[PDB]
Design a protein around this ligand. Sequence first.
Ligand SMILES: CCCCCCCCCCCCCCCCCC(=O)OC[C@H](COP(=O)(O)OC[C@H](N)C(=O)O)OC(=O)CCCCCCCCCCCCCCCCC
Ligand SMILES: CCCCCCCCCCCCCCCCCC(=O)OC[C@H](COP(=O)(O)OC[C@H](N)C(=O)O)OC(=O)CCCCCCCCCCCCCCCCC
Ligand SMILES: CCOc1cc(CC(=O)N[C@@H](CC(C)C)c2ccccc2N2CCCCC2)ccc1C(=O)O
Ligand SMILES: Nc1ncnc2c1ncn2[C@@H]1O[C@H](COP(=O)(O)OP(=O)(O)OP(=O)(O)O)[C@@H](O)[C@H]1O
Ligand SMILES: Nc1ncnc2c1ncn2[C@@H]1O[C@H](COP(=O)(O)OP(=O)(O)OP(=O)(O)O)[C@@H](O)[C@H]1O
Ligand SMILES: Nc1ncnc2c1ncn2[C@@H]1O[C@H](COP(=O)(O)OP(=O)(O)OP(=O)(O)O)[C@@H](O)[C@H]1O
Lengths: 292, 50, 49, 361, 452
Amino acid sequence: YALMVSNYLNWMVRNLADMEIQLGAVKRIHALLKTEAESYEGLLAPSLIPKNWPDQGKIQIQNLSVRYDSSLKPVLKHVNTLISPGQKIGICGRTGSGKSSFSLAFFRMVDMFEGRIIIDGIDIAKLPLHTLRSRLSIILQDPVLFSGTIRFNLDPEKKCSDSTLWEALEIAQLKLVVKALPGGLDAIITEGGENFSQGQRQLFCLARAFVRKTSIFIMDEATASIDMATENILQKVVMTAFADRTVVTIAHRVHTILSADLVMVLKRGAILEFDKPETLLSQKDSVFASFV
Amino acid sequence: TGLKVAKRLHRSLLNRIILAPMRFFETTPLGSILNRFSSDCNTIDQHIPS
Amino acid sequence: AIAKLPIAMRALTNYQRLCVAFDAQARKDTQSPQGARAIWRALCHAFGR
Amino acid sequence: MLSRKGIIPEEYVLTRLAEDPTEPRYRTRERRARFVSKKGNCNVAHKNIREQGRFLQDVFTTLVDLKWPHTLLIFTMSFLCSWLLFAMVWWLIAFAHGDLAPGEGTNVPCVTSIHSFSSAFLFSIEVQVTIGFGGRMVTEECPLAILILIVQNIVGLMINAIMLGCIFMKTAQAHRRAETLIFSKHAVITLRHGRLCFMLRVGDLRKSMIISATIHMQVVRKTTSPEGEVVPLHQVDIPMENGVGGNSIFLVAPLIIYHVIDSNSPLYDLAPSDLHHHQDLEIIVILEGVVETTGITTQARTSYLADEILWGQRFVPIVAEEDGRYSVDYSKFGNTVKVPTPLCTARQLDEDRSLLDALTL
Amino acid sequence: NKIMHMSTSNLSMGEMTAGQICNLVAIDTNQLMWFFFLCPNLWTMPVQIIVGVILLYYILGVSALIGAAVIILLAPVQYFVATKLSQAQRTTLEHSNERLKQTNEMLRGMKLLKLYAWESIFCSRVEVTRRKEMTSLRAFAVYTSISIFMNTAIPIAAVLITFVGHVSFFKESDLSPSVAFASLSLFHILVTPLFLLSSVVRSTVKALVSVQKLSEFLSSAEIRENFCVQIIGGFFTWTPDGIPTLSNITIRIPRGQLTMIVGQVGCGKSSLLLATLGEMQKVSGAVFWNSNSRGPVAYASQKPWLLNATVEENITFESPFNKQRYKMVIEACSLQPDIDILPHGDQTQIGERGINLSGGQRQRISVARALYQQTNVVFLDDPFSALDVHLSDHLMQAGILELLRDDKRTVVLVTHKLQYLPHADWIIAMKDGTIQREGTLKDFQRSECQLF
Ligand SMILES: CCCCCCCCCCCCCCCCCC(=O)OC[C@H](COP(=O)(O)OC[C@H](N)C(=O)O)OC(=O)CCCCCCCCCCCCCCCCC
Ligand SMILES: CCCCCCCCCCCCCCCCCC(=O)OC[C@H](COP(=O)(O)OC[C@H](N)C(=O)O)OC(=O)CCCCCCCCCCCCCCCCC
Ligand SMILES: CCOc1cc(CC(=O)N[C@@H](CC(C)C)c2ccccc2N2CCCCC2)ccc1C(=O)O
Ligand SMILES: Nc1ncnc2c1ncn2[C@@H]1O[C@H](COP(=O)(O)OP(=O)(O)OP(=O)(O)O)[C@@H](O)[C@H]1O
Ligand SMILES: Nc1ncnc2c1ncn2[C@@H]1O[C@H](COP(=O)(O)OP(=O)(O)OP(=O)(O)O)[C@@H](O)[C@H]1O
Ligand SMILES: Nc1ncnc2c1ncn2[C@@H]1O[C@H](COP(=O)(O)OP(=O)(O)OP(=O)(O)O)[C@@H](O)[C@H]1O
């Protein structure tokens, strides 16, 4: 036994070192597992008291001021812009001040802000994050795709195929995916969505929105999209406001932003220039020049 | 026991990172999470047992 | 804390020695290609000592 | 055997882009090194010294250098090694003659009373230490014993002479006296006679005067030339503004040492913000002069970093006058009472003064 | 070194993609290194086991031979278990990479996955992926448990069989402690190499495979090898013997001559640039390349090459820093509006395994790195298709002309930008792999067939 005491000590120390390194890995794992989401919560009885799905979609901005760190500065400050139910109000004011903040405030990306909001006549801060985003649609600013069923790419939960998706395809101009792609709806995305279009992002967003039965529609700017894609997207926004009876958008290019039913200017967290008729927007040269 | 640790820790980490705020991710280095999710999970699932 | 390694272990000198072995075996012998046998005998000839 | 580090030689490249721990950032905050420390003890670490035997040849330099406990180890071990080696020789020779064999005969032993190695060692004590106990005599029997007695006597006298020399040069050391000279923990800048100067205070504690004192003063700073010649430690000498023109000083009271900042002085472009905590700058003050008693020249090294220089303060007047003789209150040694002064540079001050004088005249 | 001297035909790069060569350089070299680590084992452990067995017989007798025989018989079985373990480990590795790629795709787009309330879909997908990976992990864990079991339970079985056989099947000695404890010590010093000689053989097989892979990599066609570009025939090929790329090409370009070129839909635009570059096997041609032996040809291509580093490093390209040329290049490409919101501007982790960028942004990166070096020639290639910012196009064209043409920095812009479709210098029009003439534009208008 004295003969073997030697390598016993050696390997004990060595395997201790390896155990130490791998336990540091466990320590970092628990560092991740010590992050708790504050926003996710439930405070009301949802069995019968809330409506099954919001229909009116009322909107009001009760001076909502959003601060993530709650110490440095806010992004919105005492904003009160009334979006007319059935009439879009998308304003490209200070780009990094109002549009990102509003989209984040509706959809729980900013669920902690001084002041509140009434969503369809009901305060939004008394509902779960997933419920708050359950009956509402939005698009992105940049494209992202990956391998997976197109049917679940549009409607993972509801999964209403061919009745809506083909109709959702109809508004889209994706003629190739029906035949040029291997299977189409039953086939998954190929090569991580690097072979279809830059309009595939907008088409998928529109397909999800129409398959969400959008009580409210939210849009965003463009990164690099085909002109035909822009025309189809804007026309289908009009048609979605025609049928689903709601639309709302946002943009950053001056002329494209002017291609809207209503618009205003919101700068430095507050309101800069608001006119209910769109004619006054053309009347104001300086405000129009502000964007570009 | 190593197998049990692997399964339960992985599913718990998935669940928690799902129910997480995306403001943190915009603050997170976006590769630190990927590291401690691939390399560290591999270590505890393939080396801590042995 | 650790620093540049000694002369003998520097990759430049090791690469030089391995090239010497490859060139010497490919020149004194007549084997233009470098097959598995050639690389194997080259490593042995350069690191047998 | 029992490890699993050799079973799997593969790797995974999925995990990457791991960085920014922020741990090394705190390490960079460690304070930079000082040239000479406050209590002398210059903080320079020579590297790649090629010894070439110049660190054993000067043996008698080393023997004086060493500490007293080490010097006593060498002392004791020199004597004892000599005693024991010559005891071995006495034992062996008195054994060869047979005087160790008990009751050998009437043959007269070549050294009497050698009846052991123990008595042989005692005999070496008696011979070398020159004690001569009557029991152990040296008889006229064998010539080798007389030769070895001569050799041991000469070697013992030489070893005594060498140890006397080293004890002489060690009991007259200086580093026990260099520490009894006192500087300020921090030096001050202030205007005297309308001109900016860099004051300082130095004093003596022992009553024993320090003769022919001498105060060199240098600035240590990395500095380049117009030709790109970069010197990491470009020491520059500085006059002591002493009226006579020499730098000698008569040190009894705590004196104020300062260099007037004229156009020559390399401190001619200092600003109160230009001498902050981490600024690269250091003043050295070499205080030389012999000790009156032993007549051994000494130095009192000391330094003053940037974060010790303090603008616009004057040393508290330390000397008072008691009933019959003066008084020195060493508690007020390094106290620097605040004194307002212009906060501009030495060049800006000089140019402004010249312009104002020209306009007035 | 043989990466440098290597050729870039589609017979090479279309088979051993960057994934293959990275796997080689890492895995193959690692396992060859491991074989050179374990080499003394395959020489010694034969002697070790043989001498141990022989003097185990001397110490005790036949019974020791029987115990050693049991261990040796179970050696092939443990090799089978370990090899099956390795197969399961490779299966688990493949499934782990699948799951990791899936989680990269998922966690990347957390913005639209959380806003659109779509955690459930990819949660289920990852759940099912982990189910399959868990089955593979179960097999791996079972096999490695058997390996642990055999490793720590063969010495006891060997000792048990030895002593019981000695007592009953032999009944020869009293088994005095001097024999029993010597034998147990021998069993320790024999079980350690006996259980591991199998692994040494395994690494020998793997090393032979690695040298096969390295030799195959080393057995591919690699080395193709006054007025700047003086060409006579110019007929080069991709395949080292045959498959021609072009024919009947000839130019003679003095310095500063912004000899822009034209083309068709993937018809001899970048191929012409590459055949000039010297990476194509020149069959029917004679070129005397000489300077006012080559020069530092600035260059780019359709898909920009980038360094996975910070943006500053990715632009400077291992060269000094000079603020005048730096500012001029980063404005003529307008680099500041492009890097506006990247988390630290220049200091961002551009490149793969990190920041993902768009075609136009990467296009600015490539053109900046190409121009900045302050060299005598520049071969830009199609920087105006993905990056089609009209204002930036005019800015880049103004910068290109004024800077490049003045200092004699030839800028051969082989692209299809209309705003200067008629170049400010020599032009040459290529179509379907034939390019008529490389002279002035007056004779080109004289031909008058390619009217806009
Ligand atoms: C171009 C011309 C060049 C010169 C040519 C000269 C030609 C001469 C011919 C040869 C004769 C030389 C005889 C020397 C043999 C012994 C040398 C020796 O022990 O000292 C060696 C060293 C240093 O001295 P060196 O390097 O020789 O110097 C001479 C030369 N000129 C030089 O400076 O390079 O010495 C030391 O490094 C001594 C260390 C002292 C430490 C004190 C303890 C001593 C230990 C012994 C006693 C310990 C105490 C115990 C007592 C026991 C009693 C036995
Ligand atoms: C932990 C390991 C760290 C290693 C780092 C270095 C090691 C250093 C060791 C330090 C601690 C030693 C403790 C020794 C206790 C006795 C000290 C002693 O008697 O000296 C008293 C004084 C000197 O004072 P010091 O503190 O030694 O000063 C040394 C200082 N550093 C210097 O350089 O200044 O001495 C004098 O000023 C001389 C007066 C002598 C008067 C009478 C003589 C007594 C001794 C005679 C010799 C007796 C030998 C007996 C040998 C018997 C063998 C069988
Ligand atoms: C980085 C690897 O560089 C090394 C390389 C060596 C040489 C060596 O034979 N290794 C393999 C053996 C073979 C059979 C796999 C091994 C790996 C893990 C545990 C023990 C062992 N055997 C070691 C020899 C005695 C029996 C058990 C040693 C030590 C190291 C080291 O970490 O410094
Ligand atoms: N590392 C070192 N340690 C101590 N002394 C040194 C060292 N390097 C050089 N010297 C000494 O500096 C002097 C000049 O050295 P230098 O480097 O200029 O030339 P050298 O080629 O080393 O000279 P030499 O052949 O005289 O030793 C010589 O006295 C030499 O012994
Ligand atoms: N009266 C004194 N006796 C001995 N040393 C002194 C005396 N005054 C100053 N020193 C020395 O000056 C240096 C300053 O250290 P310390 O912080 O104790 O003093 P200080 O800040 O200058 O203040 P003060 O003069 O009030 O003691 C030290 O090296 C200290 O030994
Ligand atoms: N990477 C390549 N390696 C080898 N041959 C190639 C490569 N790419 C294209 N070729 C060959 O060269 C021919 C001409 O390609 P060319 O250089 O005109 O393309 P290009 O400039 O990249 O095209 P475009 O800019 O219109 O996409 C192709 O038809 C093909 O046969």
